[PDB]
Amino acid sequence: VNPTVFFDIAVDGEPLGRVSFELFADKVPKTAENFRALSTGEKGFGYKGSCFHRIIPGFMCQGGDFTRHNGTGGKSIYGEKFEDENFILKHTGPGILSMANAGPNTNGSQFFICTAKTEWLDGKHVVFGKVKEGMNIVEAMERFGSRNGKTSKKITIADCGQLE
Amino acid sequence: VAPV
């Protein structure tokens, strides 16, 4: 029942690999649906062609700013911002897919893939998914990161959509 | 860091 979405990652335009995610629509349906629809481009806007603006090795890979490409933008399928649905799920370790935000109830399109346990983010960021396949590709993307988050090479979602 |  839980949807599966895919991202085809590219490094400086060169294909790297595919990361697939299980979206926890059972536990966080509204947040899951946002990511799913943004990955399909159903609503006319979404992640295709977007980049990962901030990659910090040993922490996380952040993306989803399809409007300004630098962390200052992004929009939800429900308007500019939506509420924190719930905090049932926690940042248990690598692979966790959670929503970025600028404070309470400020979810848009920006998300992050955890490359380590981020328990300080529990209760502040909504966890809605996890990497099902291609954690190896996330690890490969992480090596283009830096301590300040700046990427050594452009990491982009060349293609994205829904599997099955 | 995880903000916007």
Author numbering:
A (entry chain A): 2 to 165
B (entry chain C): 1 to 4
Question: Could you pull the original sentences from the published paper?
Answer:
Peptidylprolyl isomerase A (PPIA, or CypA) is a specific cytosolic binding protein for CsA and is responsible for CsA’s immunomodulating effects. Here, we identify peptidylprolyl isomerase A (PPIA) is required for NRF2 protein stability. Mechanistically, PPIA physically binds to NRF2 and blocks the access of ubiquitin/Kelch Like ECH Associated Protein 1 (KEAP1) to NRF2, thus preventing ubiquitin-mediated degradation.
Pull-down using recombinant PPIA-conjugated beads showed that the intrinsically disordered linker between the Neh4 and Neh5 domains (135-182aa), but not the Neh domains, is required for PPIA binding. Among these five prolines, P174A abolished the binding of NRF2 to PPIA in pull-down assay. We synthesized a Proline-174-harboring hydrophobic peptide sequence (169VAQVAPVD176) located in the linker between the Neh4 and Neh5 domains and co-crystalized it with full-length PPIA using a hanging-drop apparatus. The structure of the complex was resolved with a resolution of 1.81 Å, and a final Rfree of 0.2478. Overall, the structural data demonstrated that the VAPV fragment deeply embedded in the catalytic pocket of PPIA formed by R55, F60, M61, D66, F67, N101, and F113. The guanidine of PPIA’s R55 side chain directly interacts with the main chain of P174 of the NRF2 peptide. Of note, P174 is buried in the catalytic cleft of PPIA in a trans conformation, which may be the result of the peptide bonds preceding and following P174, tightly anchoring P174 in the active pocket of PPIA. The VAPV peptide displayed a similar conformation at this location as residues 3 to 6 of CsA, which can potentially explain CsA’s disruption of the PPIA and NRF2 interaction. In line with the complex structure of PPIA and PBM fragment, a residue-specific NMR spectroscopy showed that C52, G59, D66, F67, and F113—all located in the catalytic pocket of PPIA—as the most affected residues.
